[PDB]
Every structure is written in structure tokens, then in C-alpha cells.
Amino acid sequence: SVYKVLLLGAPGVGKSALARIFGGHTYDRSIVVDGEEASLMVYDIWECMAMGDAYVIVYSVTDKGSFEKASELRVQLRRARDVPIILVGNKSDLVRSREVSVDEGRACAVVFDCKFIETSAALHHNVQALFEGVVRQIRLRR
């Protein structure tokens, strides 16, 4: 039961940051979601066919570019290849230089069939939740 999770997105959004947090390259760690264990391997790929159990697409809420690159990715993913996709708006802490609102993320995931969450790698906020929902989401689509 080793779920393989791919970390995708535009440059500088905070991918390597999210991987590192979650697993103290490729990142290993087992977690408990709903009474049930779970062994995630997280691939910070921008640091192989495509053998992914889930995709996390990260954008920064301070970078509209990264955000619209994310939709573009989401559509690509869907045309090419099923596997669950999680849409992540990282950097929720930079309240000031924010370019994408929460609602824009949610009301764009829902329509393009992603799980949405905002994280802040800098404040270890929702990084836990993110990788928990990744596990849950792989289970929702057996």
C-alpha cells in the first residue's frame, strides 16, 4: 500500500517546501488517515513514464501565472490519461501580495474536478491536511 504522489506546478510556488515539510528528490513517510494507515511516497519531480497514484498541482496565491498554468496542467492531465488531482494554493501567509483569492481556487477546482486546499509552507498550515486528503482522495477513486 505505497501510494505514489507527484508534485507538479510552475517554478517558485513552493513544491520543494511542501515536500520537505511533509517528509522531514523523493520523500517517504507513513500517516494515519481515518483509523487507517497509509504510506505516501512524494516525488518532487522538477528537482518516468507516469506511475502516479495522485497528482498535486501547486500554484502560489501570490502568482496568477502559476494559477493559470495549473488549470492548463489540469486539462492536460485529463486529456492525456482516473487518478485524483489536488489543486494547491500555497503561500496563504503572504496576505498582501496575494493574486488569487480562495474562492477562485475552490470555484475552479470544483468545476475542473480537483480537490482544493490552500496551504502555507511557511506556517506549516494545511500541509498535514493536504497529504491526508491526497490519501482520502486516492481511496475515494479506489
Ligand SMILES: Nc1nc2c(ncn2[C@@H]2O[C@H](COP(=O)(O)OP(=O)(O)NP(=O)(O)O)[C@@H](O)[C@H]2O)c(=O)[nH]1
Ligand atoms: N511566505 C511563504 N514563502 C513560501 C511558502 N512556500 C514556499 N515559499 C518560498 O518560496 C520560494 C520557493 O520555494 P520552493 O519550495 O523552492 O518552490 P519550488 O516550487 O520548489 N521551486 P522550484 O520549482 O524551482 O523547485 C522559497 O524562497 C520558499 O521559502 C509559503 O507558504 N509562504
